[PDB]
Amino acid sequence: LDLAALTAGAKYKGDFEERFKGVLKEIEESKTLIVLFIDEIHMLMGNGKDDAANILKPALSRGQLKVIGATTNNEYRSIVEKDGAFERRFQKIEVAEPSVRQTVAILRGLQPKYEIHHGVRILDSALVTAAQLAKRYLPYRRLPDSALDLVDISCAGVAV
Amino acid sequence: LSEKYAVSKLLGTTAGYVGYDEGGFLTNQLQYKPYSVLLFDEVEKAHPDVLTVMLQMLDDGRITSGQGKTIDCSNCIVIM
């Protein structure tokens, strides 16, 4: 959920609620356990609030309307500062990066995807070293992605 | 640390001032991470005005920000 129907899909002043309220009501009952989710929930604070979709949602929070969001910690901070309300509905769930060894475990799970994606074999030691490499040389990136970048980049390198 | 302090540590930008990255380094870390341990490196050279305002956390473990929000993470550990 969001950005497309909630923003691109708007020409009129009530378009923050048209379609949006519609779908909120469409999903309240009968049609299995519908859960919407927001990948870029930062928008849902509103630019100056003004109920830019953001208030109608929590306004209806007494039931159903199950939604999971996602924000970075600083975006969280910003939507909190810029709203004060969605936070009463939303549970803050902290996500920590994995250790290097744990990162390798995901790399292993992902390894065959990459071998397939690029048509190349990958060594287990590739994954192991990618993760420790990243810890050492990529301070501005988190391990999951950093290690994967080393893998997917290397694979792409070879693919070319 | 200089007398500007605010953002680089615990207070953050007074809301309404440009820079909405506020207390990123310390307060927001506690905001995000209920509590942890903090280490105050060479407090002798910290700006005096700052040493003074950090007292709000040293005892009466309050953490009021420029965001207008308060963390109060008295559950943390501080080492100076």
């Binding site: 549970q91 803050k92 769930i93 | 509590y35 559950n75």
Partner: peptide, 28 residues
């Protein structure tokens, strides 16, 4: 599983609020 004052509140709260100080673990 009668909701437990201690173990349930502490554990579920800890998963969301951290608070390891409230765990009272057997690994003390």
């Amino acid at each position: 599983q009668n909701v437990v004052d201690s173990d349930t509140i502490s554990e579920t709260a800890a998963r969301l609020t951290g608070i390891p100080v409230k765990k009272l673990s057997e690994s003390e």
